[PDB]
């Protein structure tokens, strides 16, 4: 969860709204096991 610790402050002449972009990935202790098919199958009918 993200909360305002203080407040977004800006002077006269600057926008009152800005955006944040979030990037994510795993640390170096990350590992996965037991291969399985993904839950999605991107196909509805036959692929021509």
* Residue 47 near another protein by CB under 8 A: no
Q: Min. distance of Cβ 26 from another protein in angstroms?
A: 5
Smaller CB distance to another protein: residue 28 or 48?
28
16: DSSP letter: S
27-46 residues in contact with another protein (CB under 8 A) are 27-41, 43
| Distances from the Cα of 29 to the Cα of 14, 26, 32, angstroms | 42, 8, 10
Contact flags string 4-23 toward another protein, x per CB under 8 A: xxxxxxxxxxxxxxxxxxxx
Whether the CA torsion 9, 10, 15, 20 is positive or negative: it is negative
């Amino acid at each position: 969860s993200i909360w305002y610790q203080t407040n977004y402050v800006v002077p006269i002449g600057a926008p009152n709204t800005a955006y944040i972009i979030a990037l994510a990935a795993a640390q170096k202790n990350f590992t996965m096991k037991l291969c399985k098919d993904a839950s999605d199958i991107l196909q509805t009918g036959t692929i021509q």
